[PDB]
Design an enzyme around this catalytic site. Structure first.
Site, mmCIF file in Angstrom:
data_model
loop_
_atom_site.group_PDB
_atom_site.id
_atom_site.type_symbol
_atom_site.label_atom_id
_atom_site.label_comp_id
_atom_site.label_asym_id
_atom_site.label_seq_id
_atom_site.Cartn_x
_atom_site.Cartn_y
_atom_site.Cartn_z
ATOM 1 C CE1 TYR A 363 33.824 41.923 48.817
ATOM 2 C CE2 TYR A 363 34.863 40.142 49.841
ATOM 3 C CZ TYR A 363 34.941 41.428 49.155
ATOM 4 O OH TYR A 363 36.330 41.524 48.934
HETATM 5 C C1 F43 Z 1 35.705 40.956 42.126
HETATM 6 C C2 F43 Z 1 35.528 42.895 42.479
HETATM 7 C C3 F43 Z 1 33.982 42.266 43.638
HETATM 8 C C4 F43 Z 1 34.043 41.653 44.673
HETATM 9 O O1 F43 Z 1 33.179 41.300 45.480
HETATM 10 N N1 F43 Z 1 34.966 42.245 45.231
HETATM 11 C C5 F43 Z 1 35.358 43.281 44.103
HETATM 12 C C6 F43 Z 1 37.907 42.349 44.391
HETATM 13 C C7 F43 Z 1 38.339 41.987 46.288
HETATM 14 C C8 F43 Z 1 39.194 40.877 46.038
HETATM 15 C C9 F43 Z 1 40.744 41.712 45.205
HETATM 16 C C10 F43 Z 1 41.988 40.921 45.313
HETATM 17 C C11 F43 Z 1 41.789 40.371 43.599
HETATM 18 O O2 F43 Z 1 42.690 40.914 42.826
HETATM 19 O O3 F43 Z 1 41.216 38.639 43.829
HETATM 20 C C12 F43 Z 1 39.935 41.760 47.343
HETATM 21 C C13 F43 Z 1 40.882 42.544 48.110
HETATM 22 C C14 F43 Z 1 38.454 40.586 48.452
HETATM 23 C C15 F43 Z 1 39.735 39.414 48.573
HETATM 24 N N2 F43 Z 1 39.280 38.243 47.662
HETATM 25 O O4 F43 Z 1 40.762 39.067 49.719
HETATM 26 C C16 F43 Z 1 38.801 43.062 47.707
HETATM 27 N N3 F43 Z 1 37.899 43.394 46.557
HETATM 28 NI NI1 F43 Z 1 36.896 45.134 46.299
HETATM 29 N N4 F43 Z 1 38.764 45.732 47.591
HETATM 30 C C17 F43 Z 1 38.836 47.364 47.668
HETATM 31 C C18 F43 Z 1 38.392 48.463 47.032
HETATM 32 C C19 F43 Z 1 37.018 48.641 46.123
HETATM 33 C C20 F43 Z 1 36.883 49.538 45.899
HETATM 34 C C21 F43 Z 1 37.621 49.576 44.093
HETATM 35 C C22 F43 Z 1 37.501 51.470 43.865
HETATM 36 C C23 F43 Z 1 38.947 51.426 42.444
HETATM 37 O O5 F43 Z 1 38.344 52.557 41.626
HETATM 38 O O6 F43 Z 1 39.934 50.985 42.622
HETATM 39 C C24 F43 Z 1 36.227 48.612 44.181
HETATM 40 C C25 F43 Z 1 34.397 48.862 44.918
HETATM 41 C C26 F43 Z 1 33.762 50.228 44.822
HETATM 42 O O7 F43 Z 1 34.152 51.053 44.250
HETATM 43 O O8 F43 Z 1 33.860 51.140 45.619
HETATM 44 C C27 F43 Z 1 35.929 47.073 44.778
HETATM 45 C C28 F43 Z 1 35.887 46.151 43.713
HETATM 46 C C29 F43 Z 1 35.744 44.640 43.737
HETATM 47 N N5 F43 Z 1 36.334 44.068 44.653
HETATM 48 C C30 F43 Z 1 35.140 44.068 42.516
HETATM 49 C C31 F43 Z 1 36.730 44.270 41.736
HETATM 50 C C32 F43 Z 1 36.849 45.738 40.813
HETATM 51 C C33 F43 Z 1 37.900 45.479 39.469
HETATM 52 O O9 F43 Z 1 37.118 44.734 38.491
HETATM 53 O O10 F43 Z 1 38.140 46.430 39.405
HETATM 54 N N6 F43 Z 1 36.860 46.991 45.522
HETATM 55 C C34 F43 Z 1 38.644 49.869 48.044
HETATM 56 O O11 F43 Z 1 37.371 50.086 47.493
HETATM 57 C C35 F43 Z 1 39.716 50.131 48.611
HETATM 58 C C36 F43 Z 1 40.241 48.629 48.920
HETATM 59 C C37 F43 Z 1 40.153 47.058 48.142
HETATM 60 C C38 F43 Z 1 40.015 46.215 49.092
HETATM 61 C C39 F43 Z 1 41.861 45.341 49.580
HETATM 62 C C40 F43 Z 1 42.243 46.459 51.009
HETATM 63 O O12 F43 Z 1 41.759 46.873 50.798
HETATM 64 O O13 F43 Z 1 43.138 45.213 50.948
HETATM 65 C C41 F43 Z 1 39.761 45.468 48.008
HETATM 66 C C42 F43 Z 1 38.767 43.936 48.678
HETATM 67 C C1 TP7 Z 2 26.618 36.665 54.559
HETATM 68 C C2 TP7 Z 2 26.985 36.614 55.315
HETATM 69 O O1 TP7 Z 2 27.535 35.260 53.796
HETATM 70 P P1 TP7 Z 2 27.081 33.507 53.666
HETATM 71 O O2 TP7 Z 2 25.066 34.038 54.054
HETATM 72 O O3 TP7 Z 2 27.495 32.770 54.873
HETATM 73 O O4 TP7 Z 2 26.479 33.453 52.507
HETATM 74 C C3 TP7 Z 2 28.709 35.884 55.955
HETATM 75 N N1 TP7 Z 2 29.334 37.168 55.595
HETATM 76 C C4 TP7 Z 2 30.194 38.279 56.192
HETATM 77 O O5 TP7 Z 2 28.955 38.618 57.269
HETATM 78 C C5 TP7 Z 2 30.923 39.044 55.403
HETATM 79 C C6 TP7 Z 2 31.829 38.901 54.940
HETATM 80 C C7 TP7 Z 2 32.624 39.841 54.422
HETATM 81 C C8 TP7 Z 2 32.649 41.534 54.411
HETATM 82 C C9 TP7 Z 2 32.840 41.708 53.288
HETATM 83 C C10 TP7 Z 2 32.708 43.323 53.000
HETATM 84 S S1 TP7 Z 2 31.349 43.726 53.388
HETATM 85 C C11 TP7 Z 2 29.029 35.003 55.831
HETATM 86 O O6 TP7 Z 2 30.377 34.491 56.099
HETATM 87 O O7 TP7 Z 2 28.514 33.769 57.112
HETATM 88 O O1 COM Z 3 33.007 45.160 44.231
HETATM 89 S S1 COM Z 3 32.132 45.439 45.636
HETATM 90 O O2 COM Z 3 31.050 46.641 46.189
HETATM 91 O O3 COM Z 3 30.881 44.554 45.613
HETATM 92 C C1 COM Z 3 33.230 44.582 47.195
HETATM 93 C C2 COM Z 3 34.121 45.160 47.312
HETATM 94 S S2 COM Z 3 35.299 45.136 48.671
#
Ligand code: F43
Ligand code: TP7
Ligand code: COM
Lengths: 429, 118, 247, 560, 483
Positions: A363
């Site tokens: 992010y």
């Molecule tokens: C790669 C990351 C790290 C990162 O920066 N973002 C990820 C992935 C990203 C992608 C997943 C899409 C894809 O597969 O390309 C998106 C949808 C963001 C996007 N690009 O639109 C997202 N997460 Ni994440 N992510 C979520 C969540 C979570 C929860 C999932 C826990 C569980 O047991 O499944 C955990 C973190 C935590 O422990 O809370 C999580 C991690 C992670 N999140 C791990 C992937 C974990 C894995 O390999 O299983 N997300 C959630 O807590 C639920 C909602 C879900 C979001 C999608 C939606 O709500 O629309 C998604 C939100």
């Molecule tokens: C931190 C900052 O990122 P950069 O400093 O631009 O790399 C900023 N992100 C956003 O505030 C967060 C978007 C993603 C939120 C994920 C759930 S916390 C942005 O887009 O400018």
């Molecule tokens: O895997 S991370 O907690 O850093 C992002 C989940 S939306």
């Protein structure tokens, strides 16, 4: 409130220095550091010549084909320095200094302090330096009347079409004031790699200078009025400036085989011995909740412990990566193990949470070296969490990708030639 | 297969000259449709503090062309024609010499639509 | 005594522009003050001038050196409201052009706010000062009733080809030829008067082109006026260098 | 409440124990702690089958890889069953895919309605006309001018049928003035509100007259949100010039041009700093109070818990799925961080239980009124929040399906904290009391389960407790004023939706007419909008069924 | 047989066979205009070499062409809004985001050679060998991605949307394709690289006073708008290139960004003036208007004076002999705009310098003013009177090569009918030299794709198609909308 300030070798600098005497608005050396950061700017003569020759100017990927000017700026960098000093200086013999850094490739332009007192902010330094360099180019290299724009944009980038000098070759320690997240945040807008590079990768020098900038920017933003002045000064003295040598004592005692837990034990032991906290209640299971007799002093102890723990963790691992986890978990386990809030009352802990998230996810953010006091991720701690980031980056060993060189080569090369920055603790003391 | 033309009088035609001119052009062979463009002639002030007042323009007259009464909203200062053959373009330019008493231009090209709308 | 030249040019248009700017126009007709007030359509003719604030005599003024040194115009000393007279000039050799009508206004009348468009030239001033300026502009050769006229709204018609009888087009008919003379029968806002204002006859095409300030290929063209072109080149060249380096 | 608890149970029954599509989940015990994972793959959804078919077809049609579930690492999506979502407080069953804002037309239309709307003050323009132009303004003149504005604003070169959603209305605190004006252009505070609500609205706006301006939705989509103010200003100037018989060009009329264009113009949002640079009328600058006011649930209902919950639902959607899900982040989306707070009635069940608890302990302090409310202290916040959080945790630990539903810890933490903060603000009538209860709920959650949320969900919740009551410069504002641009809230999901519902509750429980801005409550108090702000959560469900017709569609100027 | 009465004189698109009513060229009623702005808005360029260095250092991976094939397939799956890592989540419907894809163009000839040719923009195939050589020299042996996020996401959001969405999906695709952990420091470095370190935005962010953000029309400088338009890649007529850039820039700036221009791309007046100018320059300066880097003349005041004065005089004569576009009820500011555009394009073509074209523009304006006594409405004259002295100044806030100028330039900040001319002048400065790109080769190669719903080779022809209800834009929601 009187502390001692100890340099990074653990030596005694000054004894009994009153805390209020050490404030940004009162200390002479901090004011000089602020003025120098405001007025000094760095010019990349090599980059200027490259843009002129290849037409690669105005940002990323930009290149004007067919208008290349072939000037030997690097060869005649001394005459360029003399003429830029002639242009920039307001009066003869004033504080205007221009130096040629690192064999002609770059310049150091420090505009006179009069140009600071005669303007609203620091951008006069950047604009006057860019104007002086452009004028000297047009003067000594005989640029045609119709080639003036190219020589101008080889220094100014895309300004005014862009807010800042995007693609330019003149830049300062601080970004443009339009990039602030709030009122007074300009002094906070210095990325970690800049402080790491300026102090030549010295951990308790990068930490000291970063905390100086952070506290200056927080005083500017009305963060120290009344009791909060003491609250922030205690934190600055204890963490940034090595008050009574607590940080370095802890570093030595938990260096060879220490961890986060041992540093937590060290902080709690010192607090309990000094009387900053005492057992308030004892639960039936034997756990002793502690109460902070001196609340700002306990915050200062938590900040000092945070910095010491970051030192220990990121020096045992030699990775600047661990700084986020150190900042989070030191305070978190401190709360769990004493019954008191962490440094800055959960603010440092939350900044560590966000900074660990954004440096460990898709992010944004980046390595620990691209975070500053103005970053939306880390603009929350009142000066106690960014010093640890800068110290961690200075304490890395080739693990990061966006290294100090990559993002701040010019800044390091130019501003590492000021003694008030290489030795910030000595300057402040 | 058709070609289309405009006539550009050097002075915006009054209704009388435009009355005769357009009248016999309809007698000209080889015209699919004709257009007359020019300044508009309001019947009421629509701007300024004198808004909503009666204006009875000297140029707003019911031209009698081809047994049809047409109430000009405009001073015809541009006439674009439509001819399926070029040999009538010689005819159209010829007639504009006789009964338009001053200098005019005569071009050719796509003018009216040659394109579906809506 | 620096004798102004007002413009470069040896052609006829040069002399005409020098005349318009210099105000040495020929009073080519005459119009009564009641008729002028009626045509301006700002108020009822033959009344006192409404004021937007009390006279400066009693209103009191600050100790500004400029006020003490710049004698206020009579239309402002009485606190008259601000009003406008607007004209539309034809590019087909009409005796004046917006920029040069504005030059006349700004060189010849105090307390004026001329404003130039491509199809208008508004003069805005205290009501009786604008009265004076409008009377001068209407009574002199600067205004040809056929190739000009007051127009407060819907000023379209400056770049339109003249009427088939040689009058600039008007959507609202603030004036038209009546029996061989121009008769203005509406305000500049195009709500009718109670009367009919006689502006004389429209100057013929030849003498109109003789006393014009527009540059045309039919009449004296801009291309052969080497003096004006030289002036423009010199001004543009000076602008370009002095932007580069003021030296 | 038992009735809400019952509907929560029914939602779990219809979600897990009942089969959806072809996941073969029919049967089960929503209180059971075991299940068998069939691993049917994304082809169990049927709608996902539609997406797979469309993606493959587009891949052949265009000539590059488009959408292949096989490029999910490991195995395709859906190794555990695809169970649906039920919108809280309603019975429309929605697939997860339909609740992604790209796939929900009503979800888009909400933001396209807040974005394209502006309110321009009108007293100063009339005052300038009266004083410095002599053209006295009479209600007949206002009628004519508003008629001129109403269709000029659509553009009159804008297409007559392409801008049908472009209109202007007026509302006035002057009771006698709004009586004469043609009712087709008037929002009448006295008959869209109750007597006391309208009394407070009139008392707060005074004797002032305002315009509600809505520019065409297609214009808002094409440009950004900062075009709304300029479009409105230009149409206002045109209407003033063309409706009051004033010449364009004189200097004095420029003062009126200023006065009517932008002297009393109130924007939905404001500017943002550099990292998130954006202009006015973007979700980052939209306050929590402004979102509380755009939701007309207060105007049309007396239940405070329902009002707070409806604001929470809409808020999560606007601030998570659109703002943080798309602008700041983009990607797949954040639809499931948001559906937690407006689907499956866990939040409603917790909040109604908290209402019962407060009314039982504090003599109906959570009932409507202003005198029964308990003064906000640490003891009250600690009590209400902890009990709320403990009950929510006991419900997750007692219904394993509710835990699996909010599988990611962030959803559970958001639901618990929203319930606790809403309960605290209801009991105390203090929005910051709700905030502090929210943060205490987060702390109880963390210490009870050993896990709070995603990596950085705890940023504004560690910073949460200490900043609620600070009066330092960049820390502290009443919640009603706070927003996504607040320093702590700028970059994290699962919070900002509940924060708005917290502020709404502090004033909903008091029977207040508006949260922070009366001009917004009356501006959006118009049932002519294509979106129904009276109940937004029912609107998202309507979009997810493909039964919502939005504005800004270009079908008339496009080949068929 | 019929008699038509109208007072609006329908416009005919310049160099085309399409006449469109004046209210069909409004961007509200013209879908092609909106699609053009969407394509410019939703497009971004991210480098692959810095991410590759991060992967090879931090993780110790090997980045071979087969891994890039797998990663690009993953990314083209994940960019339209689909998940690639974790489970039980939504995904944007493939029907509504079908206008989204990612391609790589590289200055490495081999690396482009063994990569799957469905994700590669081949510079050698798309460009002439001279232009291709120039581009490969400019970019080096570096790979770049050409990301185009969905139209609907950009319409429901602003232009700041693009870099964020692209960086998130690029990071996720790296994670899926290179078998690295979901959350670790290497993922952050990739995100920081994509978001900032190696991102090329269509436009930069604007100052606070202009209440708008990044990748809007106000940040899109004239060089980027020149490079987006793909006539310099398709044709060799140095005047047609400049005229196409003028026609697209007038729309994009005046109609959208500032909210008339139409004449610049209608009725073939400015085209006729420009072609006469080119003939005159060839006749007097030994054919300097032809393609080439040597046949161009050094730009001096005398040359620009001659070219601009002659162009202005010819335009004035043509107006005064056959106006045919005056009498529009709204004045003649478009006359000044057309004359200045012709003069500036002629000066740029003759000299190969953009600021010479600007000087021609302003000189033509002054000659207009002195010849007729008209210049335009109240506004308009500001920019010219100023800018004539800002062409060659090298002061900080005034003076930039035109290529680096844009709608956020101080003088050009607020007024209409000028910025399209400047974009055309910047294009013509290099088009007559036969250059591959104006100021940014990455934008020049990024838009050399035929999958765009908008044809950037013929922008004016695209406007003509849009005006006749024969342009199909993306971003339509008919799938989700009720029937
Ligand atoms: C790669 C990351 C790290 C990162 O920066 N973002 C990820 C992935 C990203 C992608 C997943 C899409 C894809 O597969 O390309 C998106 C949808 C963001 C996007 N690009 O639109 C997202 N997460 Ni994440 N992510 C979520 C969540 C979570 C929860 C999932 C826990 C569980 O047991 O499944 C955990 C973190 C935590 O422990 O809370 C999580 C991690 C992670 N999140 C791990 C992937 C974990 C894995 O390999 O299983 N997300 C959630 O807590 C639920 C909602 C879900 C979001 C999608 C939606 O709500 O629309 C998604 C939100
Ligand atoms: C931190 C900052 O990122 P950069 O400093 O631009 O790399 C900023 N992100 C956003 O505030 C967060 C978007 C993603 C939120 C994920 C759930 S916390 C942005 O887009 O400018
Ligand atoms: O895997 S991370 O907690 O850093 C992002 C989940 S939306």
């Amino acid at each position: 409130d009187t502390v001692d300030i100890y340099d990074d070798r653990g030596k005694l600098l000054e004894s009994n220095v009153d805390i209020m005497s050490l404030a940004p608005t009162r200390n002479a050396a901090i004011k000089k550091i602020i003025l120098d950061t405001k007025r000094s700017v760095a010019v990349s003569l090599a980059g200027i010549q490259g843009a002129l020759a290849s037409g690669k100017m105005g940002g990323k990927g930009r290149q004007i084909l067919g208008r290349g000017l072939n000037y030997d700026l690097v060869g005649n960098a001394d005459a360029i320095a003399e003429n830029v000093k002639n242009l920039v200086q307001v009066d003869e013999g004033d504080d205007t200094s221009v130096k040629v850094i690192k064999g002609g490739k770059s310049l150091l332009i420090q505009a006179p302090s009069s140009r600071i007192a005669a303007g609203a902010d620091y951008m006069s330094a950047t604009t006057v330096g860019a104007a002086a360099v452009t004028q000297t180019i047009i003067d000594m290299f005989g640029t045609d009347m119709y080639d003036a724009p190219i020589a101008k944009s080889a220094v100014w980038g895309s300004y005014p079409q862009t807010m800042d000098l995007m693609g330019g070759n003149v830049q300062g320690v601080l970004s443009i004031p339009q990039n602030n997240e709030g009122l007074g945040f300009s002094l906070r807008n210095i990325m970690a790699n800049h402080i790491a590079a300026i102090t030549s990768r010295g951990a308790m020098n990068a930490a000291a200078l970063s905390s100086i900038y952070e506290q200056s920017g927080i005083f500017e933003m009305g963060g120290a009025v009344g009791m909060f002045e003491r609250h922030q000064l205690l934190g600055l003295a204890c963490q940034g400036l090595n008050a009574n040598n607590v940080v370095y004592d802890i570093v030595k005692e938990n260096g060879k085989d220490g961890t986060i837990g041992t540093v937590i034990e060290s902080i709690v032991g010192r607090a309990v011995e000094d009387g900053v906290i005492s057992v308030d209640k004892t639960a039936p299971s034997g756990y002793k909740f502690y109460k902070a007799n001196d609340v700002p002093m306990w915050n200062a102890y938590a900040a000092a412990g945070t910095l010491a723990a970051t030192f220990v963790n990121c020096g045992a691992g030699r990775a600047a990566q661990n700084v986020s986890s150190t900042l989070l978990y030191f305070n978190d386990i401190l709360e769990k193990e004493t019954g008191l809030p962490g440094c800055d009352y959960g603010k440092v802990q939350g900044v560590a949470v966000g900074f660990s998230f954004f440096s460990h996810s898709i992010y944004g953010g980046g390595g620990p070296g691209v975070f500053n006091g103005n970053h939306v991720v880390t603009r929350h701690s009142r000066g106690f969490a960014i010093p640890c980031v800068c110290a961690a980056v200075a304490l890395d060993a080739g693990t990061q990708m966006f290294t100090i060189e990559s993002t701040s080569g010019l800044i390091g090369d130019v501003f590492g030639s000021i003694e008030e920055f290489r030795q910030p603790i000595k300057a402040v003391a | 297969d058709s070609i289309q033309i405009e006539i550009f009088p050097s002075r915006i035609l009054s209704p009388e000259t435009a009355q005769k001119l357009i009248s016999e052009l309809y007698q000209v062979d080889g015209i699919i449709r004709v257009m007359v463009q020019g300044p508009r002639l309001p019947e009421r002030v629509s701007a300024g503090p004198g808004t909503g007042e009666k204006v009875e323009h000297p140029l707003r007259k019911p031209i009698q062309i081809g047994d049809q009464v047409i109430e000009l909203k405009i001073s015809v200062g541009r006439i674009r024609l439509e001819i399926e053959n070029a040999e009538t373009k010689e005819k159209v330019r010829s007639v504009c010499d006789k009964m338009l008493p001053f200098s005019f231009e005569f071009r050719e090209g796509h003018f009216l639509r040659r394109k579906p709308t809506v | 005594a620096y004798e102004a030249q007002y413009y470069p040019g040896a052609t006829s248009v040069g002399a005409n522009r020098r005349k318009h700017m210099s105000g040495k126009l020929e009073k080519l007709r005459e119009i009564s003050d009641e008729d002028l007030t009626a045509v301006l359509g700002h108020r009822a003719p033959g009344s006192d001038y409404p004021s937007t604030h009390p006279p400066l005599a009693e209103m009191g003024e600050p100790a500004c050196s400029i006020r003490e040194a710049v004698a206020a115009t009579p239309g402002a000393a009485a606190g008259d409201r601000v009003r406008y007279v607007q004209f539309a000039d034809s590019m087909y050799n009409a005796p004046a052009t917006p920029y040069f009508r504005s030059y006349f206004a700004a060189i010849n009348f105090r307390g004026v706010d001329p404003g130039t468009l491509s199809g208008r030239q508004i003069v805005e001033a205290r009501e009786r000062d604008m009265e004076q300026c409008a009377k001068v502009q209407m009574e002199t050769e600067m205004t040809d009733p056929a190739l000009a006229g007051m127009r407060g709204a819907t000023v379209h018609g400056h770049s339109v080809r003249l009427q088939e009888d040689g009058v600039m087009f008007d959507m609202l008919d603030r004036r038209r030829l009546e029996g061989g003379v121009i008769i203005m029968d509406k305000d500049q806002v195009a709500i009718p008067l109670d009367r009919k204002v006689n502006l004389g006859k429209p100057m013929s095409s030849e003498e109109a082109a003789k006393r014009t300030t527009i540059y045309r290929v039919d009449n004296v063209a801009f291309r052969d006026d080497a003096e004006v072109i030289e002036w423009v080149h010199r001004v543009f060249d000076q602008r370009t260098s002095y932007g580069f380096q003021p030296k | 409440a038992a009735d809400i608890f019952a509907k929560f149970k029914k939602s779990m029954e219809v979600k897990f124990t009942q089969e959806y599509g072809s996941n073969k989940q029919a049967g089960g015990d929503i209180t059971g702690k075991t299940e068998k994972f069939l691993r049917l793959g994304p082809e169990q959804d049927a709608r996902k089958q539609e997406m797979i078919k469309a993606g493959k077809e587009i891949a052949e049609k265009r000539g590059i890889a488009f959408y292949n579930p096989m490029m999910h690492m490991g195995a395709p999506l859906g190794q555990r069953a695809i169970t649906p979502y039920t919108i809280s407080g309603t019975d429309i069953v929605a697939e997860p895919d339909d609740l992604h804002y790209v796939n929900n037309a009503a979800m888009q239309q909400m933001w396209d309605d807040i974005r394209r709307t502006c309110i321009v003050g009108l007293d100063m323009a009339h005052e300038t006309l009266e004083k410095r132009l002599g053209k006295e303004v009479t209600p007949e003149t206002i009628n004519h001018y508003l008629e001129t504005l109403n269709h000029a604003m659509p553009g009159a070169e804008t297409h007559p049928a392409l801008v049908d959603d472009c209109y202007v209305k007026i509302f006035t605190g002057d009771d006698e003035l709004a009586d004469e004006i043609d009712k087709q252009y008037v929002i009448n505070v006295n008959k869209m509100f109750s007597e006391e609500q309208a009394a407070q609205i009139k008392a707060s706006i005074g004797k002032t007259t305002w315009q509600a301006i809505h520019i065409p939705t297609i214009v808002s989509r094409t440009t950004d949100g900062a075009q709304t103010s300029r479009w409105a200003a230009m149409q206002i100037g045109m209407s003033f010039i063309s409706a009051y018989a004033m010449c364009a060009g004189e200097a004095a009329v420029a003062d009126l041009s200023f006065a009517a264009k932008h002297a009393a113009l109130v924007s939905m949002g404001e500017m943002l700093p550099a990292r998130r640079a954006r202009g006015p009328n973007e979700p980052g600058g939209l306050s929590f109070g402004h979102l509380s006011d755009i939701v007309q649930t207060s105007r049309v209902s007396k239940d405070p818990a329902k009002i707070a919950l409806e604001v929470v639902g809409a808020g999560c959607m606007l601030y998570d799925q659109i703002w943080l899900g798309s602008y700041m982040s983009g990607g797949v989306g954040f639809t499931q961080y948001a559906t937690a707070a407006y689907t499956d009635d866990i939040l409603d069940n917790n909040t109604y239980y908290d209402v019962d608890y407060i009314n039982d302990k504090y003599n109906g302090a959570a009932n409507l009124g202003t005198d029964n409310k308990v003064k906000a202290t640490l003891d009250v916040v600690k009590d209400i929040a902890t009990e709320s959080t403990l009950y929510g945790i006991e419900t997750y630990e007692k219904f394993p399906t509710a835990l699996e539903d909010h599988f990611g810890g962030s959803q559970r933490a958001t639901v618990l904290a929203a319930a606790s903060g809403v309960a605290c603000a209801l009991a105390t009538g203090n929005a910051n009391a709700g905030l502090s209860g929210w943060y205490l709920s987060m702390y109880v959650h963390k210490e009870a389960w050993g896990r709070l949320g995603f990596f950085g969900f705890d940023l504004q919740d560690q910073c949460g407790a200490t900043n609620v009551l600070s009066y330092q410069g960049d820390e502290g504002l009443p919640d009603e004023l706070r927003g996504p641009n607040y320093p702590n809230y700028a970059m994290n999901v699962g919070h900002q939706g509940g924060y708005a519902g917290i502020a709404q509750a502090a004033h909903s429980g008091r029977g207040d007419a508006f949260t922070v801005n009366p001009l917004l409550k009356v501006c959006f108090a118009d049932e002519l909008m294509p979106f129904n702000f009276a109940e937004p959560r029912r609107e998202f469900g309507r979009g997810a069924i493909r039964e919502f017709m939005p504005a800004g569609e270009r079908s008339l100027v496009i080949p068929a």
